[PDB]
Curated annotation (Swiss-Prot):
Entry protein name: Serine protease inhibitor Kazal-type 6
The keyword Signal appears for this protein: yes
Its biological purpose: Serine protease inhibitor selective for kallikreins. Efficiently inhibits KLK4, KLK5, KLK6, KLK7, KLK12, KLK13 and KLK14. Doesn't inhibit KLK8.
Gene: SPINK6
Location(s), subcellular: Secreted
Segments forming domain Kazal-like: 1-57
Residue numbers carrying Pyrrolidone carboxylic acid: Q1
Highest taxon of the lineage: Eukaryota
Coiled coil: none
TM helices/strands, residue ranges: none
Keyword Disulfide bond recorded: yes
Disulfide pairings: C7-C39, C17-C36, C25-C57
Molecular function (Gene Ontology), one example: serine-type endopeptidase inhibitor activity
Annotated positions for site Reactive bond: R19, E20
Amino acid sequence: QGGQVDCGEFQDTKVYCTRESNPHCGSDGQTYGNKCAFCKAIVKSGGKISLKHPGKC
């Protein structure tokens, strides 16, 4: 929230990413290779997107 790996896209508050490759299949439907990849993707639909799967779908 201002001193974290805060994905400055930050459409939401829980938008922080990984330094690792932690895949996420977002509730956006999409699968992202890591959480960082999922940040903008949270941003995709308001920040309000959540995760379906740790990993891909």
